[PDB]
Design a protein around this nucleic acid. Sequence first.
RNA 1: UAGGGAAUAGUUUAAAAAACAUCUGACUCACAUUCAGAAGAUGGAGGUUCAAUUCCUCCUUCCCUAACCA
Lengths: 157, 146, 29, 238, 31
Amino acid sequence: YKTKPTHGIGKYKHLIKAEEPVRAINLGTDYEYGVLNIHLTAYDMTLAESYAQYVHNLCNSLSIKVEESYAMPTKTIEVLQLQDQGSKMLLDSVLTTHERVVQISGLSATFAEIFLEIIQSSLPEGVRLSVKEHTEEDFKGRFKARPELEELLAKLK
Amino acid sequence: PKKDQEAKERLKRKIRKLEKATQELIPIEDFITPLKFLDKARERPQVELTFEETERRALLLKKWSLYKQQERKMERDTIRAMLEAQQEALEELQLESPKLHAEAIKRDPNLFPFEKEGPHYTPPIPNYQPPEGRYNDITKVYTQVE
Amino acid sequence: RRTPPLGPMPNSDIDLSNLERLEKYRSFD
Amino acid sequence: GSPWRLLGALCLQRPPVVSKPLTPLQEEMASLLQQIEIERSLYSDHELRALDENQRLAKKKADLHDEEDEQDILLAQDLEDMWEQKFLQFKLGARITEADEKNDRTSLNRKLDRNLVLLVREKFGDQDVWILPQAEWQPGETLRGTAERTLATLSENNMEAKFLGNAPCGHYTFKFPQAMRTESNLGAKVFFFKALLLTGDFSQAGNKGHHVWVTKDELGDYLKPKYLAQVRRFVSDL
Amino acid sequence: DSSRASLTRVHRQAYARLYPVLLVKQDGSTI
RNA sequence: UAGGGAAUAGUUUAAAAAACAUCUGACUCACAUUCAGAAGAUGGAGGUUCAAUUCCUCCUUCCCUAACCA
């Protein structure tokens, strides 16, 4: 009851984060990096995932906020090979590139050195660590191509 | 114009409608299961493990847990030492010269993008001639309608 | 009208400035 | 100026070129993981083909004739033989190199599966002391430049190293001997900075008595115990 | 260490057997 | 002032078609007619619905009626 010293003892909504409904991306300050995209490309999916999983728990262990962990579409490259003493290039290998992303944010500037060292140290054989800064270009690259918008865009050109 | 300019303004309407439309996410072929795998003919016969096999696999996984504990132990000690080194160096630097400390704690704009390749199984051959060939990308192109 | 609490109120020692940083009871138990 | 002499050291490392061999415990687990994968996997294309062809042979032996006139000339079993022949003729690289047999400690081709640090032989007061390459800080310059300055003051080399950030991974302070210690030079304050040797190497003029690349396992015999102690906190063999 | 997160299995329900092979790159290095 | 109804290709009517206009061609010495092709719209914005030509609500717009008794 409001007039009582115990008023508000049942308050709880201030302890929760405000989740009241697209979303603006928050860039980092001058002493912390913004959203960072830890890409993990590889020819063996199991190795791409096993290391993406490893770095999620690693980030989780270091109290580094992991905004999102997602997979990028698979790229299928057909290795063609010139036949011996001939001309017709005959396919032999069909390789596939599996990329996995672990999106973090709030990495301290001074601590980024220690973190970057640990992750590169543990990199498996066959996997490429590409750590870049998150940008709208990367986010848009995960969405299907829209041919209609391109056709209408040509009219404006 | 009543028709030429009509279309010119209809473009803005199309842009607004399409821009406000939802964007579909490209599927990840890794997660989707092809229908050919559903065929039961592919299913291989299952062989029951012997008692000794099940006993040694259970004994191995036990060791694997204590092993992976040792790994994580050394990994935590390394990060600790590194953190302690920086913290002790930062303090004396600030007292010695606050002007350098201010710059030292700043972020490095050139640190990223940071790309690093993983080790290979065998090192490169100094003089190896790779065979001639071509790379043909066949990545399925997915198109969003509506 | 308000009466001040007679002692520490529940949940007062929780720093809500760094809400997103604080650990959570991810579990019921 | 300040009484202390600012110094910028470089903690250059070459990340391992090959993966480390699996230990006996890891070897058994890898064998089991492959074994489990087979048991939980569906018949592959090649495996399925092989089975089918073996059946056609029985329809071409016990049966009067096989109506399938599509008999694969190359069987799957036979096709595996061609693949196996290609591997035997091919020769891999040498994980264990010649520096191992000859114990060369001035090359970047030693301990391919380990991490190596750059040690340089300096002459300090008519005395040979092994330290991490360093340069003296200059007024009107950030401590990062001092680290980069060391690279430009090294013996003929095309070494290109990627620095990690801009923070001193460590420090080491020592007092000059009482003979030469003075009010203007109380001591020194070194600040180590890590970088990843990417491409390049020193020339062939003089590298024997100029520098060595150790793996942190022999770093003791060279570095001053005191120095060495303050040097093994940031350099991690892992 | 390049073995920390290297020992894996295929984590699926239905998948075709996969054989270990060495991919010889254009530089002679293998994985 | 207050209520109701109505915004569909450039046009006019349908429930996204049709006839015109336009564009391309054929026929003609040429044009028109004619013939054969082609493109061409749901007023804007805001929704829901398994799906919006009959549905919103608003804006913008045009119309229709009413505005009386002392």
